[PDB]
Every structure is written in structure tokens, then in C-alpha cells.
């Protein structure tokens, strides 16, 4: 929350749709991290269809900037709620106000030139408390195309990968929901046909000695971009209408 | 050259206390007090939760039906669960509960070396009549700050995808403040006192702390 | 910037400060006088230099 | 108003207090301003920029 | 694989090997200056204050 | 949860009186506590003997002029401070400056006592001008556990006891294998010649160890 405010932040928090605002006043029947169910007062209530106002909260999902947008309930079980009151906080909003960051203890003084120009010198207490930590949500895609050499397979059978590589994938070639990955990990196995490598003499000798069959298939599999690491919160499979959906899908 | 020794160790709250060192020579109250501040805040034994495996959960970013806390917030709440052991360097606690109401730190399954210093400490709430959360809360012991990130180098089949690593909080110490007040033993020219007022989660006794602190301090002098 | 505020604060003189008027053998015991809290960073003092 | 609220706080009017270097433990000369400043993390984050 | 042994080899190839550092508005020739690389844990470049 | 200990890898010492020693690898943050603590001890409290007071044969005052000496009396006092005096079981000793002539008075021109040892016969006390130039006097030393200034003798010469003429510590990053960032702590120190720097450190931290003997256990 801002410790030093203005009094506008409340208005920004509410007017912007990031929060979840009560349609009608009443008592809270149910509070889940998923949803919030409110029992309406009669004076605000329409005669027909009785009612309760059910609010389905947005859960962890990809924002436009590749940040995370997630709503949290600010109310508890069986609480009075006025009409036009905040039922849930959006990202960067606290208790119905706008918190775009965090307030902290700050001291103005040169410290060993580590603050030199505009530079900022921050205690380990902050990085430990995980307060300035941020959750990014990235959307990666794997495209199965059609090449004149043949169609591309999403199959989990990938030329030249260890059992450790094919472990995080199911039988169908897609990564399990929830598996934490890093750079180099294969999210989706994809292989495209390229036949007749047309190798050279020494390579042919090598193959003659080691008796390896050079595959007619090339590895196009979508892998996590180098250096970035996180957890898988969802997977979607779009299929051309009429093509047989694989096992995973 | 009179060597110092401690004196009354006054417990105020389960949280913090003021310890004291009586026989201090010229300027040595600072020479000691600051070094001791340093070693106290930094290097200390502590036991914090590391790996948590919950009921139906693949990852910390989902929600469990029947509890208003997101898995992320629950893990964060667990990181702040203070415990203490005796004869084990890792102990795996068992948490079970159901029914509508708060799930506190006392709802776990007590073990031989388990001591819950804050039984009222909140894990997460329970919003529905029949909903039940079971978790194996793996709590080990160590030093300093080990983030969940640096934890995977070793790896070696961490495959139980339901296992969520959290950052290591290990440390008893919250705040250390030393004061040097002139202390007059009944007869001497001039001497000072070291009042070391520390702050803890209650998982370490003051004398234990200050002792192992001084211990490591001298242990670095081993050069000669 | 920071550095010049450092050297400026270093060599400057106030009217009255710890160790005012005394005398020292050389820069060594001057610094030793300062770090021990006996003499103030800025005080008018005669010292021998080479 | 701010100083008046600082009185209610038990904290000095100057907004500055005594601070000690966590390294040497000795006091910093002069008072320094300490307070609570609301701060934002913009997303320029270095593991993007690199 | 970033095997343990490669970091030392990198410390070998880095030693006497300078690198060129440059900023966005290059005006005078000092806009580019050569430095001796020092291996640092982080994603940020560290540049001497006097420069 | 086992702990890291160093031992000094390098002692790089210029001449005799001066020494610069490097110590590594340390734990993160330990370089500054070691360095600072040892620095405060080395500086503010050390055993040593120097000149507390010197009677002036010529005059009664610090402000005057001697016959045969261009040095102001305070300048001579300065030189007196820089005299290296290591005394034996004799707790207090007094010497005499006896010499006269056209030549500069050194520290070898002082009288020789039993328990007295001067480290520098070269040390310049005062110069003598032409002819006779009446000079000689008696110098009274003392003992101290710290550094005692001139004004501090309240009820005049600054008493410089601690052998250390300077102490500095540079804490810079140390690298060990798979251990990311460590402390490489470099102590540099100067002495007045009485005790060599190397053992001066040893006794200095022996003081600390003694201060700590009332607390620890185990490793021993």
C-alpha cells in the first residue's frame, strides 16, 4: 500500500477493472480463492429469480506485458458488504487502494560510492523478504506445419534426446502442468521430416563403424528460451477442425 | 587485562531479550558489541521449512478448491512457520485438517523433536464444510539464506512434481542492537557494560546464541 | 561528485574540534589520532611533513 | 503538520537520526535523514535487457 | 552444460584480453574505451566511476 | 552445517617495520568484522612504552629557544615522541641526553641504562649549532595499554604507546571453485620497530581471544 498517499489511489483502484467490485450489497455466503458468493439484501434484490451474486475471480494468467495478473479475495466468510465495495484485490491493489510498489525504510547518505550517480544500494533483507519479487507469465507456442517433405508430428518420440529429456513430457509430447522448467527444457516435442541427409565420406565411415541409422526426421521441438525459468500453469491445444486429436489434447 | 564474562540474561518476551557482559575494558565494548552484532545477524543455526508437498497440487500457482488462500500464499505462510528440533537435521512434518475454520500451526502431527513456538501461526483458512488439506511439510536445518533457485544444481530426480521447494529462511535472529553504558563494578578505575539486546523467533536461547557467536568469532582467529 | 564531497569534507576546518592546537609527528599518527576518535577530522593543527 | 505528527511519533523533528556503520560499528558523523519512501520497480529488469 | 571446468578456462582467455565498451550517444572518441574484463556474478555491466 | 576457516596464504612485507598480509578465503561478511575488530584493538589498545615527559635543562617552557638549537622546544618534543623505547622489567626508566658540540644530537647520544633499549641510534632528536651549545637533559618514559595524548595527562608530551603506526584493511572478493563470492581480507600495518608487525597482530588478537575465553566450547 502506499504509506505516503494522495487519496486518488482508491479511485484508480476501483474505477480500473483490475479489482472486483460488488454489484449489490449483502452478506458473503462463500469465499474461495476461486470465487466469491454474496447473498443479496432484499431491498436491492429483484423480486424474481431470488438471487445471490456470484463472482468468478480471475486467476493466474498472462497480462499483455508478460507480467502476472491475479485476483485475491479481500473479504472473509460471512462478512457484511456494502453495495459498491471491493470484493477482491487485483494485482498491485491493496484493500481497495492502488499500490504500485512498496514503501521501505530509506536513508540518504553516500555509502562507499555504491550509490554513485542515481545508483541504489539495497539490503539483503529486501531480497530475502521477497517483496520486490515479481511473477511473469509468458506464452510460448509450438506450430505443427505442412512441408512438401511431409507433415510435422507433435509426437514424444524425438531423435537424439536422453530419458531425462523425454521424462518431463507425457506420451503425447507435451509437458505436464506444474513441472518447473529452465533453459533447454523441452516444453513440446515436435519433429519435421527432412529425408536423405546426403552425408560425406568420413561421416559415412563413421556410420559404417558405429552402425547408426541417421533419421529422416529433424527435431523442431519448442524449448524454453535460454536463461528463463519458471513453472507451467496451463497448456492449450488448437486443432484444425477434422484432424484427429492426439492423446494429450 | 581483565577478560569479560556475562551477567544477568533478562528474558522479556518469547520473542526477544537483553543479554549483558559486565567486565569490559577501554573501548572493548564496541570492539566486541559490533563484531558480535555481525556474527549474530549473519551466521546462526536455524530450522525453516524447505520442501512442501500438498494434496492435489502440481505447482504453487494454482488454487485448491475449499481454501481461500492461493498455494503461493500458503507456501509463503509456511516459510514463516517457526519450529525447532533436537536430534534431527531434517524432519518431515505431517499436516492434516478439514472442516470450516482456520488451519493453524498446531494442527500438524507432533513428532519427537518437533517444537511449535507459535501454535497460532496461520497456515491458511478453510472455507467449506467438507474440504480437507493434507501436506507433508519437509523442514530441515541450516544457515544463512538459501533461495529456492540456487537449490537446484544437484537436482537428481526431484521428479515428485507435487513437491514445491521454497526459499530457505534459516536464522533465529531478527534484530540485534548493542549498547555500551559505563558500568561501575564496585572498585575499578573505568569500565563499561555491553548490553546486547537481540530479537529472535524464540527458536534459539540467548546464551546459546551469544555463545556460538563468540565461538565462531574465536574460531576465525585459528590462523595463529 | 561523491568523491569530491569526500575530499572536500576531509580537508576543511571548523573553528573548534577535538585535538585543536596539538602537534603530531607525521600523517601516520594523524590518521591514528583520527580513527581512535581522539581527534576530529577537521581541526587546526601543526604537523610535521616530509 | 509533519513535525507535529513526528512528535506524536516519538521521533525527532529533524527527520534525521544517528546512524552507525554496520561494518565498523562506529557512529556516522552528522545526522542522516531516514524515513519511508514509497518505491516502484519499473520493468526494465536486467534479465530482459541483457 | 556449463561444466565446472570451463569457468577457469574462461578466466584464462579473459586475462590479458581487453574488451571495448561503448555508450549510446557517441560523440568524442572517448565514447568508446577499452577495459580489462573482470568476471562478475550478475547480469549487469560494472563500469569504473571516473569514466 | 560446517564452517569455513582460512589460513594466511601470503605475507608480503616491505622491509622490516612495514608488513602487508593477505588472509583468505573467508566467509561472506567476515572480512569486515575481522578487519574492523582487529583494527580497533591494534590501534586503540596495545602494550608499549614512550615518552610521557621531558624536563628542559635550558628553560621551564615548551615555548622558548635553546642556545645552539634552532628547533623550537615543541619540535624537539615531536622528535622525542618518535623515539623507540622498549623497556625490560623496569617499569619506569629515565635517561639523560648528555652530549654537546657542533654536531646534531642523535638517539645514540643518550645515556645507556640497563633495562633501556633504543631501536634507532640513527634517530634525530635535535641538531646542535656551533661551538659549545649547552645541552643535556633527562627523559621520563611510561607504560600504557592504549594511546594517551598530551592533554590527557590532566593532573607535557603526547605518549604514543601502541607500536602500530598505521593499520588498514582491504576487503575484496575471493573466489573458491563452486563457492560464488567470498572475502579476501588484507591487513596492512606499520610499527615503530619495537615489536615486529607479524607478532603484533598475534598478540593483538590474543587480546580478543582472551576477551572471548568466558564464552565458547566445542572445537577448542
Curated annotation (Swiss-Prot), chain B:
Cellular component terms (Gene Ontology): cytoplasm; DNA-directed RNA polymerase complex
The protein's name: DNA-directed RNA polymerase subunit alpha
Family stated for the protein in its record: Belongs to the RNA polymerase alpha chain family.
Keyword Transcription: yes
GO biological process: DNA-templated transcription
Region (Alpha N-terminal domain (alpha-NTD)): 1-224
Enzyme class: transferase
Gene Ontology molecular function terms on file: DNA binding; DNA-directed RNA polymerase activity; protein dimerization activity
Keyword tRNA-binding in annotation: no
Catalytic activity, reaction form: RNA(n) + a ribonucleoside 5'-triphosphate = RNA(n+1) + diphosphate
The protein's assembly and partners: Homodimer. The RNAP catalytic core consists of 2 alpha, 1 beta, 1 beta' and 1 omega subunit. When a sigma factor is associated with the core the holoenzyme is formed, which can initiate transcription.
Lineage of the species this protein comes from: Bacteria, Pseudomonadati, Pseudomonadota, Gammaproteobacteria, Enterobacterales
Span covered, complete protein: 8 to 231 of 329
Organism: Escherichia coli O139:H28 (strain E24377A / ETEC)
Domain remarks in the Swiss-Prot or TrEMBL record: The N-terminal domain is essential for RNAP assembly and basal transcription, whereas the C-terminal domain is involved in interaction with transcriptional regulators and with upstream promoter elements.
Gene symbol of the encoding locus: rpoA
UniProt keyword annotations, A-Z: DNA-directed RNA polymerase, Nucleotidyltransferase, Transcription, Transferase
Curated annotation (Swiss-Prot), chain C:
Origin: domain of life: Bacteria
Disulfide bonds: none
Family: Belongs to the RNA polymerase beta' chain family.
Protein task: DNA-dependent RNA polymerase catalyzes the transcription of DNA into RNA using the four ribonucleoside triphosphates as substrates.
Complex and partners: The RNAP catalytic core consists of 2 alpha, 1 beta, 1 beta' and 1 omega subunit. When a sigma factor is associated with the core the holoenzyme is formed, which can initiate transcription.
Official protein name in the record: DNA-directed RNA polymerase subunit beta'
Organism lineage: Bacteria, Pseudomonadati, Pseudomonadota, Gammaproteobacteria, Enterobacterales
Span of the entire protein shown here: 504 to 553 of 1407
UniProtKB/Swiss-Prot annotation, chain D:
Residues found modified as N6-acetyllysine: 7
Family named by the database record: Belongs to the RNA polymerase beta chain family.
Task of the protein: DNA-dependent RNA polymerase catalyzes the transcription of DNA into RNA using the four ribonucleoside triphosphates as substrates.
Quaternary structure, from the entry: The RNAP catalytic core consists of 2 alpha, 1 beta, 1 beta' and 1 omega subunit. When a sigma factor is associated with the core the holoenzyme is formed, which can initiate transcription.
Protein name: DNA-directed RNA polymerase subunit beta
Organism in which the protein naturally occurs: Escherichia coli O139:H28 (strain E24377A / ETEC)
Chain's gene name: rpoB
Covered range of the whole protein: 1194 to 1243 of 1342
UniProtKB/Swiss-Prot annotation, chain E:
Top-level division of the source organism's lineage: Bacteria
Family: Belongs to the RNA polymerase beta' chain family.
Function according to Swiss-Prot or TrEMBL: DNA-dependent RNA polymerase catalyzes the transcription of DNA into RNA using the four ribonucleoside triphosphates as substrates.
Subunit structure: The RNAP catalytic core consists of 2 alpha, 1 beta, 1 beta' and 1 omega subunit. When a sigma factor is associated with the core the holoenzyme is formed, which can initiate transcription.
Protein name, entry field: DNA-directed RNA polymerase subunit beta'
Species per Swiss-Prot/TrEMBL record: Escherichia coli O139:H28 (strain E24377A / ETEC)
Gene: rpoC
Parent-protein start and end of this portion: 403 to 453 of 1407
Amino acid at each position: 500500500k502506499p504509506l505516503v498517499g494522495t487519496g486518488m489511489e482508491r479511485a484508480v483502484a476501483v474505477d480500473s477493472g483490475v479489482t472486483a467490485v460488488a454489484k449489490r450489497g449483502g452478506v458473503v455466503q462463500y469465499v474461495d480463492a476461486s470465487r466469491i458468493v454474496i447473498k443479496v439484501n432484499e431491498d436491492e434484490m429483484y423480486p424474481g429469480e431470488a438471487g445471490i451474486d456470484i463472482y468468478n475471480l480471475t486467476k493466474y494468467t498472462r497480462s499483455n506485458q508478460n507480467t502476472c495478473i491475479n485476483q485475491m479475495p479481500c473479504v472473509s466468510l460471512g462478512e457484511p458488504v456494502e453495495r459498491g465495495d471491493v470484493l477482491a484485490d487485483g494485482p498491485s491493489t491493496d484493500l481497495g487502494e492502488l499500490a504500485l510498489g512498496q514503501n521501505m525504510r530509506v536513508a540518504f547518505m553516500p555509502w562507499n560510492g555504491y550509490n554513485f550517480e542515481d545508483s541504489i544500494l539495497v539490503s539483503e533483507r529486501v531480497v530475502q523478504e521477497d517483496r520486490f519479487t515479481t511473477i511473469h507469465i509468458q506464452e510460448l507456442a509450438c506450430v505443427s506445419r505442412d512441408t512438401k517433405l511431409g507433415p510435422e508430428e507433435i509426437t514424444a518420440d524425438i531423435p537424439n534426446v536422453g530419458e531425462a529429456a523425454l521424462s518431463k513430457l507425457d506420451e503425447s509430447g507435451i509437458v505436464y502442468i506444474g513441472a518447473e522448467v529452465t533453459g533447454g527444457d523441452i516444453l513440446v516435442g515436435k519433429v519435421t521430416p527432412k529425408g536423405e541427409t546426403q552425408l560425406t565420406p568420413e561421416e559415412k565411415l563413421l556410420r559404417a563403424i558405429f552402425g547408426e541409422k541417421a533419421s529422416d526426421v529433424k527435431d523442431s521441438s519448442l524449448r524454453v528460451p535460454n536463461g528463463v525459468s519458471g513453472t507451467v500453469i496451463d497448456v492449450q491445444v488448437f486443432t484444425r477442425d477434422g484432424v484427429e486429436k492426439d492423446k494429450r489434447a | 587485562f581483565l577478560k569479560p564474562r556475562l551477567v544477568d540474561i533478562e528474558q522479556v518476551s518469547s520473542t526477544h531479550a537483553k543479554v549483558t557482559l559486565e567486565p569490559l575494558e577501554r573501548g572493548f565494548g564496541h570492539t566486541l558489541g559490533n563484531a558480535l552484532r555481525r556474527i549474530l545477524l549473519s551466521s546462526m543455526p536455524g530450522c525453516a521449512v524447505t520442501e512442501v508437498e500438498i494434496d492435489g497440487v502440481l505447482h504453487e500457482y494454482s488454487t485448491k478448491e475449499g481454501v481461500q488462500e492461493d498455494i503461493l500464499e500458503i507456501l509463503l505462510n509456511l516459510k514463516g512457520l517457526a519450529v525447532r528440533v533436537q536430534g534431527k537435521d531434517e524432519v518431515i512434518l505431517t499436516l492434516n485438517k478439514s472442516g470450516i475454520g482456520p488451519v493453524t500451526a498446531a494442527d500438524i502431527t507432533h513428532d519427537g523433536d518437533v517444537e511449535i513456538v507459535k501454535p497460532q501461526h496461520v497456515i491458511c483458512h478453510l472455507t467449506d464444510e467438507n474440504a480437507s488439506i493434507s501436506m507433508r511439510i519437509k523442514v530441515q536445518r541450516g544457515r544463512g539464506y538459501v533461495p529456492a533457485s540456487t537449490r537446484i544444481h544437484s537436482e537428481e530426480d526431484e521428479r515428485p512434481i507435487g513437491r514445491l521447494l521454497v526459499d530457505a529462511c534459516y536464522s533465529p535472529v531478527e534484530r540485534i542492537a548493542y549498547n555500551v553504558e559505563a558500568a561501575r563494578v564496585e572498585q575499578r578505575t573505568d569500565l563499561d557494560k555491553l548490553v546486547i539486546e537481540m530479537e529472535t523467533n524464540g527458536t534459539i536461547d540467548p546464551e546459546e546464541a551469544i555463545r556460538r557467536a563468540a565461538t565462531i568469532l574465536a574460531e576465525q582467529l585459528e590462523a595463529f | 561528485q561523491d568523491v569530491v564531497l569526500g575530499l572536500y569534507y576531509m580537508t576543511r576546518d571548523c573553528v573548534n574540534a577535538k585535538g585543536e592546537g596539538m602537534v603530531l609527528t607525521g600523517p601516520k599518527e594523524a590518521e591514528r589520532l583520527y580513527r581512535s576518535g581522539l581527534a576530529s577530522l577537521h581541526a587546526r593543527v601543526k604537523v610535521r611533513i616530509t | 503538520e509533519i513535525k507535529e505528527l513526528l512528535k506524536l511519533g516519538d521521533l525527532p523533528t529533524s527527520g534525521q537520526i544517528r546512524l552507525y556503520d554496520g561494518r565498523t560499528g562506529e557512529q556516522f558523523e552528522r545526522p542522516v535523514t531516514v524515513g519511508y519512501m514509497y518505491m516502484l520497480k519499473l520493468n526494465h529488469l536486467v534479465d530482459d535487457k541483457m | 552444460r556449463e561444466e565446472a571446468v570451463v569457468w577457469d578456462i574462461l578466466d584464462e582467455v579473459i586475462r590479458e584480453h581487453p574488451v571495448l565498451l561503448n555508450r549510446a550517444p557517441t560523440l568524442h572518441r572517448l565514447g568508446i574505451q577499452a577495459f580489462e574484463p573482470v568476471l562478475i556474478e550478475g547480469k549487469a555491466i560494472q563500469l569504473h566511476p571516473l569514466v
